[PDB]
Structure formats: C-alpha cells, structure tokens
Write a protein that binds this ligand. Structure first.
Ligand SMILES: Cc1cc(Cl)c(-c2cc(C(=O)O)c3[nH]cnc3c2)cc1F
Ligand SMILES: [Zn+2]
Length: 353
C-alpha cells in the first residue's frame, strides 16, 4: 500500500545526482544566452525568471526535460482579451508616452508575438553556432526554443513579458487558497507580477497568462501552519503526493510509447489537479505523512474525475479548461481514464518492482 509508495519515493531519490548535473549543464548554457540577449536593444532588460528548485531558474518538467523562463520587464502594458478565451490576450501599450524598446515588434496597436519570437530564436540560434565549443543543438509558439545538450538533455526556453499591474479579471475567482493558505496570503500573492507567454490559440498574435513563478511560493510554503515541515512534529506528505502523481504519469506515458496515446498529457495537468486537491483538503491533518496511501488516493481519484468529466480548470483562470476538446481530444482522455482507473483499483501495478 503506502510501503510500495514509500519504496517508489526512495527509488526516485537515487536519480538526484543525475538531475542536478543535467541542471548544471542547463544553467551554464542559459547564462551564456543571457549575455547575448542583453546586447540586443530589444532584450536589454531581459533576465532569468526564478521558478525552479535547481539553481533558481531551472524547472524540471520530465526526467531529462527542463523548462527555463526568460522574463522581459514591459511597463505601461494594456491588455485586450481575445474572444472570451479568458487566458489569451492581445498586448497593447497604454498611450505612447515615449518610444519603447519593443516598438519594432508593433503591428498597429498590438505587439506581435511571432515577430518577437523570431528575433529571440535568431539571437539564440546564433549563440549555439558562434560559440560551437559547447555541445548544443536546436530541435522543433511557447516553448520558444527547445535545446538539446549532448544528445540527451532538452531545455525548453520561454520568453515572458513581465507586467507589474493588477492581475486580469479572468483570475478574480482563481487561486482559491483562502481556506487553506489564507486570504492574507492570497492578497499578497496577487500583488506580485504576472507573465504573458507567446502561445498561439488559430495562429495569431495572442499571449497566454502565466503564473508559473507562483508555484515555488506555494510548494515550499504549503501548509495551513506556517511551520508545516519546519520541525519533526509537523511532517506532511503534500510534496510526496505531487512527486508520486508526476511519477505515475511519466511511467504510464513511457508504457504507452508504442502508439503515443498519452502524448498530450503533462506534469502541468498533474500539478493543477494536485493543487485543486490542496484546496479541497485544506488542513495539515488531511496530509499526515502516516496517511500517504490515502492522500495519494485522494489525488488519483480527483485526477480520474477530471479526466472522466473532461474538465480540469486552470488554477488561476477557472473558466479556462485544460481538458477541453480544443486542447486534448476525447479519445486521449477516455484512454487515460481507463488506465488510471485500472491502476487505482489494482493498488498501482505500474509501481511494482
Ligand atoms: C498554486 C500553483 C499551481 C500551478 Cl498549476 C502553478 C503553475 C502555473 C503555470 C502557468 O503557466 O500559469 C505553470 N506553467 C508551468 N508550470 C506551472 C505551474 C503555479 C502555482 F502557484
Ligand atoms: Zn508540510
């Protein structure tokens, strides 16, 4: 039961040295790309967005797949929602007080995502070739660039517009942490900046809202108690449940590699469902380390329900469905529903040794 879950968690620890060295290779490549993008007039205010756990700017998305975000401070930014999508926006500038460094990417009033991505991709592709003394290649809206380091490690590089303004209206009912992390913490988190990433909706100049930077703020300060996991009397299994849910999807994805039916599912879907389970189970006593087996079942059941009902609300944008047929086809969801159902009813044979 939970002894099998705990053995899985022990096994995961053994691949820590390999993830850390890969993250170090990622950190080096990313830091060189930063100095070159800073030379460019359009990207001088660019910087590494702190989202990860490995050297601040390196987020792990799969065994050897890293996600790195570059942020660009964009002041006096006005947003216009694209046709009731709630997550996709056209990007404009308030009222021309002085000619901005991003004026080259303008298309009327709207700032062009593909035009900025083109210069971003062109500066990036240059650093791989100009300094060929490194072992990097390009492989293919956002992630903007996928870099393959020594034919093994892949880094997804995302360009993000930074906005220090109030969060859009579509997020008003999102981040439902009040009963768990408090209204005080919800208020404080909503004062932090938000990001826009050039993800296409069909192919246009829309930008998707991104709250990836908020994850580290909650994952590492996850309890109702401020001292949750800071002493021996307060040990919860929230982080372990998230690792097991990610592990579960990774193992299922690899097992169905022959027909690739699970290709569309990602750790982002698992994290979103995990964080909805934290909202439903707000007390630290609902995540006692001794109750690992039940807490994991709570996570799997909720994820199963999302799949079956074909609905997984974005944690920040409740009217944005990550599981709509627009994003993931009916057959793929029905397929994962069956696999997760079997795994749950059979005490997770995919975790067997
Ligand atoms: C409580 C919490 C939950 C989630 Cl799901 C996220 C989050 C959000 C985005 C995003 O694009 O908006 C992510 N993109 C890749 N990983 C992401 C993680 C952040 C949080 F603070
Ligand atoms: Zn804890």
């Amino acid at each position: 039961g939970a002894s099998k879950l705990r053995a899985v968690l022990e096994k995961l620890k053994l691949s820590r040295d390999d993830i850390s060295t890969a993250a170090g290779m990622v950190k080096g490549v990313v830091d060189h790309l930063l100095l070159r993008l800073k030379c460019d007039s359009a990207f001088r205010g660019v910087g590494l967005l702190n989202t990860g756990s490995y050297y601040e700017h390196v987020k792990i998305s799969a065994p050897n797949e890293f996600d790195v975000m570059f942020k660009l401070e964009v002041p006096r930014i006005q947003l216009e929602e694209y046709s009731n999508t709630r997550a996709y926006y056209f990007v404009k500038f308030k009222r021309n007080p002085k000619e901005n460094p991003l004026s080259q990417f303008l298309e009327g009033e709207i700032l062009s995502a593909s035009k900025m991505l083109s210069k971003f991709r062109k500066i990036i592709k240059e650093e791989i070739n100009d300094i060929k003394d490194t072992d990097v290649i390009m492989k293919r809206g956002s992630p903007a660039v996928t870099l393959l380091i020594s034919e093994k490690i892949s880094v997804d590089i995302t360009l993000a517009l930074e906005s220090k303004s109030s969060w859009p209206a579509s997020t008003q009912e999102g981040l439902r942490i009040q009963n768990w992390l408090s209204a005080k913490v919800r208020k404080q988190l909503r004062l932090k900046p938000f990001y826009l990433v050039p993800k296409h909706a069909f192919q246009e100049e829309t930008w998707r809202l991104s709250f990836s930077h908020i994850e580290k703020e909650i994952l590492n300060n996850h309890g109702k108690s401020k001292t949750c996991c800071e002493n021996k009397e307060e040990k919860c299994c929230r982080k372990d449940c998230l690792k097991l849910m990610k592990y579960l999807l990774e193992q299922l994805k690899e097992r169905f590699k022959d027909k690739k039916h699970l290709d569309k599912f990602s750790s982002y879907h698992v994290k979103t469902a995990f964080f909805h389970v934290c909202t439903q189970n707000p007390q630290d006593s609902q995540w006692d380390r001794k109750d690992l087996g039940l807490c994991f079942d709570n996570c799997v059941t909720y994820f199963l329900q999302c799949l079956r009902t074909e609905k997984l609300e974005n944690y920040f944008i409740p009217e944005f469905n990550l599981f709509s047929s627009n994003l993931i086809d009916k057959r793929s969801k029905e397929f994962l529903t069956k696999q997760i159902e079997y795994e749950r009813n059979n005490e997770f044979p995919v975790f067997d040794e």
